[PDB]
Design a protein around this ligand. Structure first.
Ligand SMILES: NC(=O)C1C=CCN([C@@H]2O[C@H](COP(=O)(O)OP(=O)(O)OC[C@H]3O[C@@H](n4cnc5c(N)ncnc54)[C@H](OP(=O)(O)O)[C@@H]3O)[C@@H](O)[C@H]2O)C1
Ligand SMILES: NC(=O)c1ccc[n+]([C@@H]2O[C@H](COP(=O)([O-])OP(=O)(O)OC[C@H]3O[C@@H](n4cnc5c(N)ncnc54)[C@H](O)[C@@H]3O)[C@@H](O)[C@H]2O)c1
Ligand SMILES: NC(=O)c1ccc[n+]([C@@H]2O[C@H](COP(=O)([O-])OP(=O)(O)OC[C@H]3O[C@@H](n4cnc5c(N)ncnc54)[C@H](O)[C@@H]3O)[C@@H](O)[C@H]2O)c1
Lengths: 173, 364, 378
């Protein structure tokens, strides 16, 4: 029941498009997709699109997981923001490029009291015009729960490896 | 209310359970925030910084704690059996929140119970998504992993990164991380970003992918049977290793021996071992608490209280864990603290309350 | 023909002027290599690795140097005045290559002169691009720059990198590096490797591009006067009191928010320039660290004291001596290869002798004394 898109279809959605928030997570680290991610960010930025990175406190599997890999890939600190700093901006962003994150975006954290993820603060990616998930399959994250964002109109599911997809997304630009 | 934060009096403890950021938040909750003078000096937090944030500076620990309804500190209070009766300074009926070490230290729990103090042991925080922000084990272990690499690099007589120069090339350092939990993962990240070749090993299966997600390589190509079997593919890499970092704990029990004396004989001279598990017996038998010992040409480093070697970053994070745990229970109106008993974070962490030991593991 | 390398007897000197690779090349050139027993222990080079490479082991320092036609040291040999006479151990008429420190140390020179010993002071290498391979200042100061950041990180009670965590954000350390030569450039790279935001400043104009290529942000001060800053040889000159105030004013904005200050600034034949006064360190944050690499040449910070960490005004001012010896196991193979690349062009094919080309500007600038006659224009 999911709108399953491809590298080509996902690419031009972000081309124009005025504002893009990159939301990286554990799958970005697993794939080592961070050099290819900053490449894409530079392709967006040079055309004139606003690019920023939204980092959840527990993105990845360790404190500062996304920070070290983005620092390796030379993304500058002035474009990287913490949850409480960046959560308002999703309303103004056209796309929420979710690369290997899932639990970090899941609105059951504030909706469903029965879930294990309930009461953890999350990034409000749903408030963006479109939500691009990159993720290999329909499997769960760390918490083991479904994301209701996967199968709602404004979302697009990109079934692939995060480095491979992002490299393939960079082709069409 | 009347929340107080004293200086840490235990030897080598430079952390404090407050920051200026958290002081501002506490007065916003409706607290008079009191803190002992000199408490944040080891954490590079001056008395003026706390005063500017809204805190009152008390001259002694007794004055700081006399009227306090809530007490925050990092390590457990000392008892009269240790020479300094710190629990006596705490007001009767008050709330204590700290790293108590409650399941290994029953005497402090007994002593707090005598004065009807309600004690919340922060190390027993339940492992749920909601309480990750309240988790002192993670916040303090993380910095200890970073430190391990800084200590290793300081003791090592070669540089971490590869350097191709006019006068020749010097190779990168080779790092082996035993145990890839919170500390081990940050040690992998810090070693790798400094230019070292980083290997790692762990008993748990999901760790292999975590090691690889930081650009490390996991050691495996192809009761007490962990120890005997593991060290064969590990020994191959350990012989090439410059800095070995051991971070493995078994909760409650002593630490597993991951490098024997036999194994350190087969290491090259000028190598260093950082044993972060030294307070629980060490992953290396040669390690000694608070000492750097040299044997077989190898430095075995066994610093105590590694988070306190990063006290100035450790203390703000600890104070935030305390604030994130505290904040949901302040009734905003009528200046009160009502710790909800349905709450898993309250029930899992509470050790004694109103003059009676509460925790299942500690009850008679 | 025979070559010898003793162990470094001076307090704290863990380096050595040899490696297994360099032994093999000397055997290829036609030298019998007699290293002293346990000379590479501080550099983590075993006697076995020297033996397998083709050296012989000698028990004492005197036995290693007894018949040696050429001797390689790191630091200058200790005289009878200093404590124990190494200069007498060396065979008369032999040739000596080391960081002799010729200009400051005149007693060691005349002692070598009186025994007909031909001394080659490696710090007096002419600054020419082909001689980068044989330049001891660059190889050692590069490792000192790396080590300054490790020293800084070790003395600092906070972490270097930015980390978003559940307990809150730990911000990145801010590093400021004063003087961007060989040591300062490596201090930028190593600080940036650890996730710090790195500022830097210098008097030379060409180093602004170098700072920005490493991801640092440069502090401009007097762009007009920075074009008349570098010499023909590539080293800095004394800028004066007016520029000092101009610089001190410009750097103040960033120094009050700086966590680690690494100072590397040197001027040949002069005391090191004062870049952080006592008024400036009182302005700094408590818990901050100053690494004074120029401490043995006066110091860029007056509060720094040789061989000690000084705590004042809430700030640690660190001033270790012999910073390359804190990286002795990397420093030593590179120091040995600096000497090999200096020596190699003068060994004959199948004569089995050494003829140091007197015509060569590399050779003339290095030589101090030869056959009992001080040739250097000092
Ligand atoms: N940071 C810390 O200190 C922590 C300490 C341990 C616990 N911890 C938890 O971890 C998750 C991390 O959230 P995130 O959204 O980053 O990741 P997840 O929501 O877990 O899942 C990310 C997805 O990335 C995908 N993933 C996994 N590998 C890939 C690759 N290679 N390429 C693309 N995507 C990948 C995978 O789905 P898939 O297997 O593709 O169907 C996952 O569902 C969160 O629940 C934290 O509480 C964090
Ligand atoms: N991650 C989170 O952290 C918690 C525990 O991890 P932590 O890092 O906080 O503390 P921890 O001390 O338990 O971590 C130690 C790590 O070392 C490993 N280990 C234990 N014994 C070992 C042995 N004999 N040989 C090799 N490795 C061994 C464990 O698997 C663990 O990952 C988990 O509950 C989880 O929620
Ligand atoms: N073989 C060669 O051609 C050779 C050898 C060595 C150095 N060099 C060149 O010389 C240059 C300097 O290298 P170095 O490491 O020997 O320099 P150095 O050790 O003499 O001094 C370090 C730096 O301090 C700076 N400095 C001096 N006074 C200052 C002040 N008042 N304020 C701020 N900065 C001040 C200098 O400009 C220099 O960059 C480099 O460009 C290097 O490439 C060339």
């Amino acid at each position: 029941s999911v709108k399953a898109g491809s590298a080509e279809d996902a690419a031009f959605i972000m081309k124009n498009a005025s504002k893009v928030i990159i939301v990286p997570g554990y799958g970005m680290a697993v794939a080592q997709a961070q050099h290819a991610l900053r490449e894409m960010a530079d392709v967006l930025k040079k055309e004139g699109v606003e690019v920023s990175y939204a980092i959840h406190p527990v993105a990845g599997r360790m404190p500062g997981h996304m920070n070290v890999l983005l620092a390796e890939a030379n993304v500058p600190y002035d474009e990287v923001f913490e949850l409480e700093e960046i959560n308002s901006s999703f309303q103004t962003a056209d796309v929420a490029f979710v690369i290997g994150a899932n639990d970090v975006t899941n609105p059951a954290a504030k909706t469903d009291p029965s879930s294990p993820i309930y009461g953890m603060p999350i990034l409000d990616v749903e408030k963006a015009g479109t939500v691009l998930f990159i993720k290999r399959s329909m499997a769960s994250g760390y918490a083991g729960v479904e994301n209701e964002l996967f199968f709602r109109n404004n979302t697009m599911m990109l079934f692939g490896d995060a480095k491979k997809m992002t490299e393939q997304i960079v082709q069409a630009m | 209310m009347k929340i107080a934060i004293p200086k840490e009096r235990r030897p080598g403890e430079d952390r404090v359970a407050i920051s200026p950021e958290v002081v501002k938040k506490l007065v916003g909750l409706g607290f008079e925030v009191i803190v002992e003078q000199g408490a944040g000096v080891g954490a590079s937090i001056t008395d003026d910084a706390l005063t500017a944030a809204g805190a009152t500076i008390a001259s002694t620990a007794a004055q700081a704690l006399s009227q306090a309804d809530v007490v925050w500190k990092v390590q457990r209070p000392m008892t009269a059996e240790e020479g300094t009766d710190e629990v006596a300074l705490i007001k009767e009926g008050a709330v204590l929140m700290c790293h108590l070490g409650a399941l290994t230290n029953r005497p402090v729990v007994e002593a707090l119970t005598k004065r009807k103090i309600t004690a919340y042991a922060m190390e027993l925080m339940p492992r749920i998504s909601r309480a990750q922000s309240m988790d002192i084990l993670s916040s303090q272990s993380n910095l200890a992993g970073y430190r391990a690499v800084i200590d290793g690099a300081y003791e090592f007589a070669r540089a971490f990164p590869m350097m191709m120069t006019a006068a020749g090339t010097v190779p990168p350092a080779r790092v082996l991380v035993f145990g890839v939990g919170v500390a081990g993962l940050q040690a992998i990240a810090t070693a790798k970003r400094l230019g070292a070749v980083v290997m790692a090993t762990d008993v748990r299966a999901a760790t292999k992918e975590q090691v690889e997600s930081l650009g490390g390589k996991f050691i495996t190509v192809d009761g007490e049977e962990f120890r005997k079997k593991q060290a064969e593919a590990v020994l191959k890499e350990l012989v090439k290793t410059d800095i070995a970092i051991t971070t493995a704990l078994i909760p409650g029990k002593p630490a597993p021996v991951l490098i024997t004396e036999e194994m350190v004989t087969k290491m090259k001279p000028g190598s260093v071992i950082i044993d972060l598990a030294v307070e629980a017996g060490g992953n290396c038998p040669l390690s000694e608490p608070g000492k750097i010992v040299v044997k077989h040409g190898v430095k075995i480093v066994g610093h105590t209280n590694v988070p306190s070697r990063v006290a100035a970053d450790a203390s703000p994070l600890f104070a935030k864990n305390l604030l994130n745990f505290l904040t949901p229970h302040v009734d905003k109106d009528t200046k009160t603290l009502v710790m909800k008993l349905e709450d898993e974070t309250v029930s899992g962490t509470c050790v004694t309350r109103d003059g009676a030991i509460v925790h299942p593991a500690l009850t008679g």
